[PDB]
Design a binder for this molecule. Structure first.
Ligand SMILES: [Zn+2]
Ligand SMILES: [Zn+2]
Lengths: 382, 356
């Protein structure tokens, strides 16, 4: 047992000064004023850094130089181990390894690997985020067009049967029967609308069937016209729909993010949707059979096509703060509480409270990580 | 003088249930509890209708079978008079006749005609709304590409010289020098961005040069995309920018209007952008219809909807000192309607011109 002290603490609901967070047995024992601590308890100074719950990234394809995609060799427990350690250096203690449209074979392999990972590393990579393959070719992005396909009943049932390791599935509502959505949803899986060219009507039909989330707002969605709001327009006007947004300033112009935050309120979650180069130092990487060069801090292919993100959660936090006029506290919620409630793990992860898992991170005013704690153990010290 | 009583009174800032409005000498003399009314003044019952400042439509090309466009015969004081009477029936007491991109000659005639109308009719058609010709062909909509053109010193100066009868000018910011925008604005003209394919950056440059309004949001503008906000995204993100929106459920999906109202706050104005058919594609919206649509389909409170049709447009074009609210000294232009949005009474300069 020990307690973090001497620094601003963000519980997820407010900032506390002259307070302490007592951690013991991998959980947060309590939050109290530094005054109510028995002098003999081990005290670890924050050195004036802001303490926050660990960041939760609900959409991440890869980082730390690797990717949980494409090959059978990549889709492995070690990739998840490498990805986890990379995120931690960025204050991200939890994430959803995201596997994009590929073969049923690789999909089934992902499930086994995730399950294998869960049996070794607790409260870290929470579960699978299957992005695809039931998408719309027109908004396929970088996905392999050969794997974009209609949903097979058997594959659908397979997913429901394995909902215990599948946190979320992104599909194009106008490309799937309502039943599939309702099926996956009733199985306990978060169904999100994305890589879709759905009209407003199709989007709303997608929500009524059970979709409760939207993947990277504005990206791989119809443009917004006066007469046809499209899926993005629809997500904006639907109060209860949660949605992620990539805040690197490249995928979404900051004005669009500010507009989205005003309309989404407490339903907008920060995501990185990052790839291999994030939290690493590589020149390029392969994906969907294409070479994505990491040229000038940008992931672009030979055509000049922006083909990926290298954002990290602290960076996203920093950008939302200084470029989008969102106060730090609300931004912190966008990286913890909100995504936690969006995937249903707020019972134990989105905030700093008694009984919650001891996953935290600390950073200085200039947004530099100084600490990352996982299951009570300090894994990052800078 | 007379007093309007027995009905809900919306001043522009609040509803009053047991009050009255006294009209005299074409002005609103006072708003007071019915029990404070001078016993001598004639009392006229609203019969339970809702009384409100007269609607102000800042973008109208035609109505009542006529149009203030195209021909030298149409751009006339008579057309303006016909449009006014037709507007009065749908609760609209003020409007900006809108002349779309055409020749310099027709523009000059429009200006002359507006001045002659003004010397004869006060507090009615307020001033000219010149939509074009400095537009972007990509977003010319129904505008004649042959007349869409760049601004030349001569035209610019003529408009500035006639700022007093020209209320607004719609232009594509990315198609004109910043100096042209500032020239118009400094002359007192409301410069509005419209029929533009402007990027967010070009839109912002326009605002800094003096643009303070945007014509029919979402229409004849770049479609919004994550990486390309365009003029529309910029307007939504710019708090000080006023803008009109067509609420017929056809030009703009109601969902976009809701997203728009939430981001624009008190800067969103209801407009019809109506044409000939309105009175008796294109728009045939009337202001009272737009009010009904906004309330029943956009989840906006009636009082806020009523402001979108009076106070806001009034402030957008700088006539709030005499119009837009039911308060002492303001011009007596009002309209009354039943809860189901049927006009029962319209008053202009204190005179009841509509009785139903
Ligand atoms: Zn995607
Ligand atoms: Zn127009």
């Amino acid at each position: 047992m020990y307690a973090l002290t001497q620094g601003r603490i963000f519980t997820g609901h407010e900032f506390l000064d002259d307070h302490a967070v007592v951690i013991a047995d991998g959980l947060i024992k309590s939050v109290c004023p530094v005054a109510e601590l028995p002098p003999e308890i081990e005290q670890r100074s924050l050195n004036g850094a802001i303490l926050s719950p660990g960041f939760i990234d609900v959409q991440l394809n890869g980082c730390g130089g690797v990717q949980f995609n494409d090959t059978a060799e990549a889709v492995s427990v070690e990739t998840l181990e490498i990805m986890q350690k990379a995120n931690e250096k960025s204050g991200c203690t939890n994430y959803l390894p995201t596997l994009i449209t590929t073969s049923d074979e690789l999909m089934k392999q992902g499930v086994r690997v995730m399950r294998e990972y869960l049996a070794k590393h607790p409260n870290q990579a929470l579960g699978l985020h299957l992005e695809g393959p039931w998408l719309n070719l027109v908004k396929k992005g970088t996905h392999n067009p050969n794997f974009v396909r209609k949903p097979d009943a058997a594959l659908v049932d397979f997913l429901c049967e394995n909902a215990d390791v599948i946190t979320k599935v992104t599909l194009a509502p106008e490309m799937v029967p309502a039943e599939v959505i309702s099926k996956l949803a009733n199985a306990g899986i978060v169904v999100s609308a994305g890589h879709s060219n759905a009209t407003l009507k199709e989007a709303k039909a997608g929500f009524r069937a059970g979709i409760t989330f939207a993947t990277h707002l504005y990206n791989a969605m119809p443009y917004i016209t006066g007469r046809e709001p499209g899926l993005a327009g629809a997500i904006l006007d639907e109060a209860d729909i949660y949605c992620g947004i990539i805040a690197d300033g490249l995928h979404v112009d900051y004005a669009n993010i500010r507009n989205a935050k005003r309309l989404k309120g407490d339903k907008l979650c920060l995501v990185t949707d990052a790839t291999a180069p994030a939290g690493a130092n590589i020149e390029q990487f392969i994906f969907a059979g294409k070479t994505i060069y990491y040229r000038n801090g940008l992931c672009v292919d030979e055509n000049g096509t922006l083909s990926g993100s290298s954002l990290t959660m602290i960076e996203g936090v920093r950008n939302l703060v200084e470029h989008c006029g969102i106060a730090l506290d609300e931004v912190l919620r966008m990286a913890t509480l909100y995504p936690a409630r969006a995937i249903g793990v707020e019972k134990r992860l989105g905030t700093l409270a008694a009984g919650k898992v001891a996953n935290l991170t600390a950073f200085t005013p200039d947004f530099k990580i100084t600490k990352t704690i996982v299951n009570g153990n300090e894994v990052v010290t800078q």
